[PDB]
Structure formats: structure tokens, C-alpha cells
Amino acid sequence: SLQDPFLNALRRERVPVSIYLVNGIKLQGQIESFDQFVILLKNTVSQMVYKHAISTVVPS
Amino acid sequence: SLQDPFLNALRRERVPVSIYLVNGIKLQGQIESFDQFVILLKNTVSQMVYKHAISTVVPS
Amino acid sequence: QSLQDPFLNALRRERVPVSIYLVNGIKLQGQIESFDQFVILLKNTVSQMVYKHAISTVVPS
Amino acid sequence: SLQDPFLNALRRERVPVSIYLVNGIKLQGQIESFDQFVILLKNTVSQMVYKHAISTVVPS
Amino acid sequence: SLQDPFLNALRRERVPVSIYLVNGIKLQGQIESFDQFVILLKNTVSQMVYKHAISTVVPS
Amino acid sequence: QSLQDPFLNALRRERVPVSIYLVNGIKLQGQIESFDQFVILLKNTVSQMVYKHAISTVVPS
RNA sequence: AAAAAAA
RNA sequence: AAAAAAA
């Protein structure tokens, strides 16, 4: 698996990320955690993002 | 699984939530219940939202 | 589980007017006639088979 | 258990149908055959339609 | 299955095809090959198209 | 994936500039760094993770 | 087929 | 959240 090491590196190093959704919308924050189906993305608030809705995850 | 505790905390504490859909539409209400495939969001009425149609779930 | 089946079953077994919003934002209206694992039969003037994968939300209208 | 008898009746009786795609596009033909993932839609020329791209099937 | 014999006939007989995508874009070419998840479409180049992105496959 | 793996392998091994069209019409460009069952790592000025479910087509640029 | 409408 | 842009 490539997801877990990629996402964990971002979380452990607390790098600012952009999550681009499939609808073109760009979410920004830090990766708090993730499982098989979701990523929790945090700024001032934690939100649950469904991977099915994500196109890409990119360091900001 | 991160999904069940995230949703259950929202449900159990009656948090006002925003559910953003993959078509960019924002729904608002409280998480009434959920299962493997759907979330029941209650404002004036209970509406069943398929998780496949959801991009994000956020406290409002 | 399970919430989906009892929610649809009550709408069906009570013949309640519903709106089914599709993921593209089109709103379909009528009554839940029937459903299975993958589809919902929506009865109006003509009865139609709606794929669940295309549905965002089901609500009483 | 509901999808297959529905599609089988349209096929057997050669019912003119509309297949609305998830992008709103409306295809018209009669259902030639179908399997788990696709439907063959017949008009002048026959075309294979992926179910994942279909929203609804309705007699025309 | 009717999908494999449908695609196989197109490939074997080198029939010019239109592949309509879920975003409404129309691709044209010959079916070079396919597997469970993708189709290789040949026009001026060979391109790998994910089936999940495809609405319809039609002889042109 | 007897077609998918050799196609991506050749682009990665040969460091071929690629274009990835997403299902929403947006085109990404870069080189394929690696890929697995669900994602492609695409590298340009940075490495980004692209979900395959969001991809329509991969082609050499 | 808008390197991407914090919706 | 155009009962639906044969694309």
C-alpha cells in the first residue's frame, strides 16, 4: 500500500496539505488521521472527508 | 474505523452538522442515525443521505 | 446496519410522497413502490427504476 | 431480485425506454440484453451502457 | 457476461468505436485491449481509459 | 491487472511524461513515481497522490 | 476533457 | 438540489 505511508508522512510531519475533491473544490489543512474509507482533515475544526470524493492529496 | 466514533460523537452530543455533497450542495441538521451506507440527517424532517453522495461531514 | 431498509420500508408501507434527489441535483417525485439491494422503484404516472448509486437523498416531500 | 425482473420484462416485451445517465443525458432505445454491469441498448445501432453511469430506466 | 463478448467482437473486428465518458466527453478509436478495470483505446495514441469513467461504448 | 499494470509500469520505468485526465475534465501532468491497487503517485514539482477512482484516462503527453 | 469554485 | 443538454 502507498496510501498509508504517504498519508502518515504528511500527518507525522504536520505538513499543510491540499485535498482536491472530485468536484474541483480544494480543501486545506492537516491530516489528523485516516482509515480505509475516510481522512480526517483539521484546521480549527476536524472534518471527515470521504476518500470516494477525493481526486488528489498534495502538500500545499 | 474512524467513521463510527466520528459520527457517533456527533449523534450522541446532538452537534449541528453540515454535510457537503459531491455536487457541492450543503445540507444542515443533526445526525439522527447512520448505518454502513446511509446517514439520517434531521432538520425539520428526517432525510436519508447515501454516504456515496457525501464529500464531507463537519460540525457547523 | 440497518437504517436504510426500515426507512424505505416505512415510506413504502405508508405510501408517503417522497422526493429522491439524484447526485446530479435532479429531483424525482412519487412513491416508493419497491426496492432491492441496488435499485428503488419509484411509482408516479409511470413506474421507474432508479439506481441507488445515482441517489443523494430520499426525503418525504 | 427487483432489478432483474424489471429489466427482463422491458427486454421480453421490447418496450421502448429512456435510460437517463448520471450526467442527465437521455438515451433512447429498447433493452436488447443486460448482465451484472451493463445494458445493451438497441436502436439503429446497438450500444453498451455501463450501469454505474445510469441514474434511471423508464418506459418511454 | 455480455460485456466481454461485446468488447471482444469490437477488438477482434477492429470496429471504429465511440466511448462516451461520464463527463460527457466523446472519445473515438479502436479497442486495442481491455481487462476487468480498463480499456486501451487506440486513435492517434494508445490511451488507458478506466471503465468507471465510461458511460457507453458504441460502434461509430 | 493484466493491461493496467504493464501500461503504468512502462510509463514509470521509462520516466515518460504523462497526462492524467480526471473524471471532472481536469488534466494533471508529471511522471509516475509509483502506483498500487487504488492510487498513483504523480511527481512534478512535488509528489501528489491521485486516487484511481477519480481518473478517466492516462496517456503519455 | 478549465493543475483543480472551503463547498 | 432545472422529472433529466443521443453525449
Query: What is the CATH number for C19?
Result: 2.30.30.100
Nearest to B3 by CA among B59, B60, B57: B57
Cα of B2 vs its chain's centroid, Å:
14
Rounded CA gap, A2 and A10, in Å?
13
C-alpha–C-alpha distance, residues D2 and C41, integer Å: 8
What residues form DSSP beta bridges with F59?
Answer: F19
In 3D, which of B54, B53, B59 has the Cα closest to residue B31? B59
User: CB pairs under 8 A, 24+ apart, for F9-15?
Assistant: F11/F58, F11/F60
Best D11, D35, D46, D50 member to test E by mutation, with max E CBs in 10 Å, is D50
* C-B interface (Cβ pairs under 8 Å ≥ 3): yes
What is the phi-psi region of residue A29: left when phi exceeds 0, alpha when psi lies from -120 to 50, beta otherwise?
A: left
Q: Which residues contact A55 (CB under 8 A, 6 or more apart)?
A: A20, A21, A22, F22, F24, F26, F50, F51, F54
Task: With CA atoms as reference, report the closest residue to E59 among D41, D51, D55.
Answer: D41
Write the DSSP symbol of residue C53.
G
Domain range spanning residue C43?
1-61
- How far from each other are the two terminal CA atoms of chain A, in whole angstroms? 23
- Cis omega (within 30 of 0) for bond into C2: yes
Q: Which experimental technique did the depositors report for determining this structure?
A: X-ray
| Cell matching residue D20 | 437517463
Number of domains in chain D: 1
C-alpha to C-alpha distance for F22 and E2, rounded to whole angstroms? 28
The CA distance from E6 to D40, in Å, is 9
In angstroms, the Cα distances linking C52 to B52, C22, E2 are 9, 9, 23
Q: What is the 3 state secondary structure string of E4-51?
A: HHHHHHHHHCCCCEEEEECCCCEEEEEEEEECCCEEEEECCCEEEEEH
Specify which residue's alpha carbon is closest to the C1' of nucleotide G5. A25
Residue with C-alpha cell 477519480? Answer: F54
Q: Mind telling me how many Å the CA of C25 is from chain B's nearest CA?
A: 7
| Pairwise CB contact (< 8 Å): B46 & C7 | yes
How much of chain F is in helix, strand and coil states, percent to nearest 5?
Answer: 20, 50, 30
Q: Is the separation of the CB atoms in C18 and C30 below 8 Å?
A: yes
* Distance in angstroms (rounded) separating the CA atoms of residues F14 and A6: 23
Q: How far is residue B35's CA from residue B16's CA, in Å, rounded to a whole number?
A: 19
Given a contact cutoff of 8 angstroms between Cβ atoms, the answer to whether C7 and B48 are in contact is: yes
Q: How far is CA C48 from CA C7, C43, D19, in A?
A: 19, 6, 10
Q: Which nucleotides of G are covered by protein (CB under 7 A)?
A: 1-7
Q: What is the resolution of this structure in A?
A: 1.9
The reply to whether residue E23 touches residue F52, judged by beta carbons under 8 angstroms, is no
Can you tell me the distance from the alpha carbon of A12 to that of A33, in angstroms, rounded to the nearest whole number?
Answer: 10
Cβ D59 vs Cβ D49: under 8 Å: no
DSSP state of B3: H
How does DSSP assign D24-59, residue by residue? S-EEEEEEEEE-SSEEEEESSS-EEEEGGGEEEEEE
Task: Give the minimum alpha-carbon distance from F49 to chain E in angstroms, rounded to a whole number.
Answer: 17
The burial class, CB within 10 Å (0-12 / 13-18 / 19+), for E39 is buried
